[PDB]
Design an enzyme around this catalytic site. Structure first.
Site, PDB file in Angstrom:
ATOM      1  N   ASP A   1      -7.782  -8.654  -2.907  1.00 52.77           N
ATOM      2  CA  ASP A   1      -8.031  -7.277  -2.523  1.00 52.77           C
ATOM      3  C   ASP A   1      -6.926  -6.723  -1.633  1.00 52.77           C
ATOM      4  O   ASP A   1      -5.988  -7.437  -1.268  1.00 52.77           O
ATOM      5  CB  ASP A   1      -9.432  -7.096  -1.891  1.00 52.77           C
ATOM      6  CG  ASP A   1      -9.512  -7.521  -0.430  1.00 52.77           C
ATOM      7  OD1 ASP A   1      -8.520  -7.387   0.318  1.00 52.77           O
ATOM      8  OD2 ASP A   1     -10.607  -7.962  -0.017  1.00 52.77           O
ATOM      9  N   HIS A   2      -7.041  -5.441  -1.305  1.00 55.25           N
ATOM     10  CA  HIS A   2      -6.055  -4.730  -0.510  1.00 55.25           C
ATOM     11  C   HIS A   2      -5.609  -5.408   0.784  1.00 55.25           C
ATOM     12  O   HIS A   2      -4.423  -5.378   1.126  1.00 55.25           O
ATOM     13  CB  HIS A   2      -6.574  -3.317  -0.207  1.00 55.25           C
ATOM     14  CG  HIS A   2      -5.496  -2.283  -0.127  1.00 55.25           C
ATOM     15  ND1 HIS A   2      -4.759  -1.893  -1.225  1.00 55.25           N
ATOM     16  CD2 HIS A   2      -5.024  -1.560   0.919  1.00 55.25           C
ATOM     17  CE1 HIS A   2      -3.879  -0.975  -0.860  1.00 55.25           C
ATOM     18  NE2 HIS A   2      -4.020  -0.755   0.435  1.00 55.25           N
TER      19      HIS A   2
ATOM     20  N   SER B   1       0.817  -1.202   0.000  1.00 58.97           N
ATOM     21  CA  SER B   1       0.000   0.000   0.000  1.00 58.97           C
ATOM     22  C   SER B   1       0.860   1.265   0.000  1.00 58.97           C
ATOM     23  O   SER B   1       1.827   1.374  -0.755  1.00 58.97           O
ATOM     24  CB  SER B   1      -0.906  -0.039   1.238  1.00 58.97           C
ATOM     25  OG  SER B   1      -1.809   1.044   1.273  1.00 58.97           O
TER      26      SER B   1
ATOM     27  N   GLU C   1      -6.506  -8.816   1.616  1.00 54.98           N
ATOM     28  CA  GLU C   1      -6.268 -10.246   1.427  1.00 54.98           C
ATOM     29  C   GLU C   1      -4.812 -10.504   1.054  1.00 54.98           C
ATOM     30  O   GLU C   1      -4.248 -11.544   1.400  1.00 54.98           O
ATOM     31  CB  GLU C   1      -7.143 -10.811   0.304  1.00 54.98           C
ATOM     32  CG  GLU C   1      -8.642 -10.735   0.532  1.00 54.98           C
ATOM     33  CD  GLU C   1      -9.431 -11.274  -0.654  1.00 54.98           C
ATOM     34  OE1 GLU C   1      -9.011 -11.042  -1.806  1.00 54.98           O
ATOM     35  OE2 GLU C   1     -10.474 -11.917  -0.437  1.00 54.98           O
TER      36      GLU C   1
ATOM     37  N   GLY D   1     -16.272 -12.237  -1.818  1.00 55.82           N
ATOM     38  CA  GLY D   1     -15.055 -12.508  -1.079  1.00 55.82           C
ATOM     39  C   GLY D   1     -14.286 -11.281  -0.618  1.00 55.82           C
ATOM     40  O   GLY D   1     -13.504 -11.372   0.328  1.00 55.82           O
TER      41      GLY D   1
ATOM     42  N   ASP E   1      -9.001  -2.603  -5.994  1.00 56.54           N
ATOM     43  CA  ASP E   1      -8.837  -3.707  -5.057  1.00 56.54           C
ATOM     44  C   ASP E   1      -9.580  -3.445  -3.754  1.00 56.54           C
ATOM     45  O   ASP E   1      -9.279  -4.056  -2.727  1.00 56.54           O
ATOM     46  CB  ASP E   1      -7.347  -3.976  -4.774  1.00 56.54           C
ATOM     47  CG  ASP E   1      -6.698  -2.913  -3.896  1.00 56.54           C
ATOM     48  OD1 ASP E   1      -7.335  -1.884  -3.586  1.00 56.54           O
ATOM     49  OD2 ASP E   1      -5.528  -3.118  -3.512  1.00 56.54           O
TER      50      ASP E   1
ATOM     51  N   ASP F   1      -7.360 -10.319   5.618  1.00 53.62           N
ATOM     52  CA  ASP F   1      -8.681 -10.828   5.251  1.00 53.62           C
ATOM     53  C   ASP F   1      -8.452 -12.174   4.562  1.00 53.62           C
ATOM     54  O   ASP F   1      -7.552 -12.315   3.724  1.00 53.62           O
ATOM     55  CB  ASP F   1      -9.402  -9.864   4.297  1.00 53.62           C
ATOM     56  CG  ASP F   1     -10.888 -10.174   4.167  1.00 53.62           C
ATOM     57  OD1 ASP F   1     -11.659  -9.826   5.091  1.00 53.62           O
ATOM     58  OD2 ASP F   1     -11.287 -10.775   3.150  1.00 53.62           O
ATOM     59  N   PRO F   2      -9.256 -13.187   4.906  1.00 53.42           N
ATOM     60  CA  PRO F   2      -9.049 -14.487   4.263  1.00 53.42           C
ATOM     61  C   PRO F   2      -9.408 -14.532   2.782  1.00 53.42           C
ATOM     62  O   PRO F   2     -10.143 -13.689   2.273  1.00 53.42           O
ATOM     63  CB  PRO F   2      -9.927 -15.422   5.092  1.00 53.42           C
ATOM     64  CG  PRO F   2     -11.073 -14.541   5.463  1.00 53.42           C
ATOM     65  CD  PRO F   2     -10.390 -13.235   5.846  1.00 53.42           C
TER      66      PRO F   2
HETATM   67 CA   LIG Z   1     -11.737 -12.433   1.388  1.00 57.16          CA
END
Ligand SMILES: [Ca+2]
Ligand SMILES: [Zn+2]
Length: 388
Positions: free
Chosen positions: A357-358, A113, A360, A286, A317, A365-366
Site C-alpha cells: 500500500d501507499h 506519491s 508500506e 495488512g 493502494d 507501515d509494516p
Molecule cells: Ca501493513
C-alpha cells in the site's frame, strides 16, 4: 555482474506528507519503522540525499523549493506566479546539496506519491523554463531566476512510486477536507508511537513561509490544521489539493511533458481485492489502518461516468487509484512502455505493479512480506547502470 555506467547521486522526494531527516525526532519518512533507506543506499555505494519541500504546497512551489535545495540559493517562486496567486516571491535560503549540478553534474530523482508530479515539473522547468515568467520579467523589469530560463538538463532519471500522475478520486470524498488532515495526524501518531513519544512532542514543519503560515508557540497541530483548512494553502488553486485532483492532474499533464533526455521509471502499487458480485474493490488484510477504514472503501467504489472514472479506477493502494500511477495519460502525449529488460529515455518505463500500500512502500507501515531493502537496492542498481 552489474554494469554500473554512472556515479550520479540520488535524491529522495516525498509526497503530500513528508519531512526532513532532522524532523519527526529522527523517524524517517523514507524507511519508517523498517529502517533508513538513504543510509542503506549510501552504505552500498550510492550517494543519496533527501529533499524536504512543502507537503501541502503546489507542485510548482515544491519544484522551486527543490531547485534551491539542490544548487543552493534563495527560493524564488517567480515574479509572475507570486503576483498571480498572492504569496511571497522569495522563500527560504539553502546552502545547496549538489552545487556541482551547475557545472556538468547529473542526478537521479526517486519520488514517492505526489513527489512524482514535482519531479516531472522540475525537469520540464529545468529544460524549457517558463515563458510567462520570462515575458513578465521584461515588462516589469525585475530579476529572473535561472530556473525559468530553461536550458538546464542535469536530471538523468526520474522514478515515481505510487504517483497520482492522473490524480486520485480520494479528493472527491464528501468530507475530504477533514479526512485529509486526519491522515496528516495519523502519520504523526505513527511516528510518535515508533519513538515512544507523545505526538504533541513531534516536530513537523509545513514550510508555508510564502503564505505567512506557521504553527504558533503552544498551538497544537489540531488547532493549526483547523487554521490551514481555511487558508489559501487549502482554498486556492496553487495547492497540492488542486494538483491531486483528476482535473488538476490533467491540467498539469498538458504542459509538463517527458524530456527526451531523461529516463522515466514508474512503479504502481495495489493492495485491494475485487468483490465478485459488487465489482467494487476492498482493502486487503495488512493495509495500514487509516486507509483501510477511511480511504480504500471510497476509492474502491467511487465512479463518475461523465469523466470515465469506471471499474478500472477502483483498484487502489489505499490512497491513490492504481490506474493513475504508471504514467501521465490524461491530457498527456508521453509514451508509456512496459519494462522489457532495457530502460529507454524520453518514455515511461512501466516497471510493474507491486502488492504494497501507499505507506508500506516507504516503510511507514509494516509489511513483512515486502522486502523493502531489496526493492530499493535493486532500483539503485538499475539507475546506476544508465548511460548519460
Ligand atoms: Ca501493513
Ligand atoms: Zn505558489
Amino acid at each position: 555482474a552489474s554494469p554500473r555506467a554512472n556515479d550520479a547521486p540520488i535524491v529522495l522526494l516525498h509526497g503530500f506528507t513528508g519531512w526532513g531527516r532532522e524532523e519527526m525526532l529522527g523517524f524517517k519518512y523514507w524507511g519508517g519503522v523498517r529502517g533508513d533507506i538513504e543510509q542503506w543506499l549510501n552504505d552500498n555505494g550510492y550517494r543519496t540525499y533527501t529533499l524536504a519541500v512543502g507537503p501541502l504546497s503546489s507542485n510548482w512551489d515544491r519544484a522551486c523549493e527543490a531547485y534551491a535545495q539542490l544548487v543552493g540559493g534563495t527560493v524564488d517562486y517567480g515574479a509572475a506566479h507570486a503576483a498571480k496567486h498572492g504569496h511571497a516571491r522569495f522563500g527560504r535560503t539553502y546552502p545547496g546539496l549538489l552545487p556541482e549540478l551547475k557545472r556538468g553534474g547529473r542526478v537521479h530523482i526517486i519520488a514517492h506519491s505526489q513527489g512524482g508530479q514535482t519531479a516531472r515539473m522540475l525537469v520540464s522547468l529545468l529544460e524549457n523554463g517558463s515563458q510567462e515568467e520570462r515575458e513578465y520579467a521584461k515588462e516589469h523589469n525585475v530579476s529572473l531566476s535561472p530556473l525559468f530560463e530553461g536550458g538546464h538538463r542535469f536530471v538523468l532519471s526520474v522514478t515515481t512510486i505510487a504517483t497520482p500522475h492522473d490524480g486520485t478520486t480520494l479528493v472527491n470524498m464528501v468530507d475530504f477536507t477533514d479526512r485529509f488532515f486526519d491522515l496528516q495526524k495519523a502519520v504523526l501518531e505513527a511516528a510518535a508511537v515508533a519513538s515512544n513519544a507523545p505526538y504533541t512532542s513531534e516536530i513537523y514543519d509545513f514550510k508555508l513561509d510564502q503564505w505567512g503560515l506557521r504553527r504558533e508557540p503552544g498551538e497544537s497541530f489540531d488547532h493549526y490544521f483547523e487554521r490551514l483548512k481555511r487558508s489559501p494553502v487549502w482554498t486556492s488553486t496553487d495547492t497540492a489539493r488542486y494538483d491531486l485532483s483528476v482535473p488538476g492532474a490533467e491540467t498539469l499533464n498538458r504542459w509538463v511533458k517527458a524530456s527526451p533526455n531523461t529516463y522515466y521509471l514508474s512503479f504502481s502499487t495495489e493492495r485491494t481485492y475485487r468483490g465478485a458480485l459488487t465489482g467494487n474493490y476492498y482493502p486487503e488484510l495488512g493495509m495500514n489502518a487509516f486507509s483501510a477504514i477511511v480511504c480504500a472503501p471510497f476509492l474502491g467504489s467511487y465512479r463518475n461516468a461523465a469523466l470515465g472514472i469506471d471499474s478500472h479506477w477502483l483498484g487502489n493502494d489505499g490512497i491513490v487509484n492504481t490506474i493513475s500511477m504508471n504514467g501521465p495519460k490524461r491530457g498527456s502525449n508521453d509514451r508509456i512502455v512496459p519494462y522489457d529488460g532495457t530502460l529507454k529515455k524520453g518514455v515511461w518505463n512501466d516497471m510493474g505493479t507491486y502488492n504494497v500500500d501507499h505507506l508500506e512502500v516507504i516503510g511507514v507501515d509494516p509489511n513483512p512480506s515486502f522486502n523493502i531493502r531489496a526493492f530499493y537496492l535493486r532500483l539503485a542498481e538499475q539507475l546506476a547502470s544508465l548511460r548519460p
